[PDB]
């Protein structure tokens, strides 16, 4: 197993961890702010997924400073992970294309 592939799998496991920790900490950060909606865990994990993939419908989002900081970590972890996979697919294609030559 090549490095690019390992970094990818590793990025995916880390993403799943950031999603679960993100869901937990967003609820922790948001309860206490009047009007906040990101306050029960099942919808926070869903919020965490749509943030990490950058879709951002939104239907829910953080209103406090710490929930937002948590949002930024989720965003960056998702963008980095999906980017790592893209780059791993590139390394794979470039390697196999040099063999077809």
């Amino acid at each position: 197993s090549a490095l690019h592939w390992r970094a990818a799998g590793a990025a995916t496991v880390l993403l799943v961890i950031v999603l679960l920790a993100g869901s937990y900490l967003a609820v922790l950060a948001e309860r206490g702010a009047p009007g906040a909606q990101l306050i029960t865990y099942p919808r926070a994990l869903w919020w965490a997924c749509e943030t990490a993939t950058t879709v951002g419908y939104x239907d829910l989002y953080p209103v406090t400073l710490w929930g937002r900081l948590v949002a930024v970590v989720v965003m960056v972890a998702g963008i980095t992970s999906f980017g790592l996979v893209t780059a791993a697919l590139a390394t794979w294609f470039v390697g196999r294309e040099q063999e077809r030559r």
Partner: antibody
Amino acid sequence: QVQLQQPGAELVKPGASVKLSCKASGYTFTSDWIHWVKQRPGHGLEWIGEIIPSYGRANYNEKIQKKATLTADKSSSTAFMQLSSLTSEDSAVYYCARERGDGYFAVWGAGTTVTVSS
Amino acid sequence: DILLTQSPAILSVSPGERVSFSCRASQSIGTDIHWYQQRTNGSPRLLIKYASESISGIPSRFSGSGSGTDFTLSINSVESEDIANYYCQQSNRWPFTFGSGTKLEI
């Protein structure tokens, strides 16, 4: 078995303070919150505050005057509510309730009847 | 904070009849409404969660409906054991809040 155990009563003199307890059993998770609800005789349910034991953070009802301070004890699985500088207005049944972080109160304590009298 | 209005405060019905308690939220809360029963001297008891979901251990006679700002708790063929106070509670926005309560009378 009873999931939340609370003392049946507490007598407190005006100006004094008391600390109510809520001992929990059954399944316990990192996502549990313990809530406290106040009910005066003949009246409705009034939310006081909440605490997430696994982390120790508490939030309180801003619409009312703060008489409560919540704390939890991980080892003894007990949540505590310290009421301070009480008056007759503070006499009521205080229930603790458990929420699995999904918004509803699955189970309630039997409640502690508090009386503020000389 | 979300204000939950329960009206009427007292509801009188005849045995076996169908009854409906109403809960109106001051703003839209999807289906994040929960219903509780509290008999004289008893502690509250969860009856319906998320507006219409059944709870194990609760007679099938009980059902909930609504979404948005208007919610209903219904009882098919009311009986004596149903005499109590009924409360709705919302979990859509912080802080959680309760409705003022409806008393069932037979």
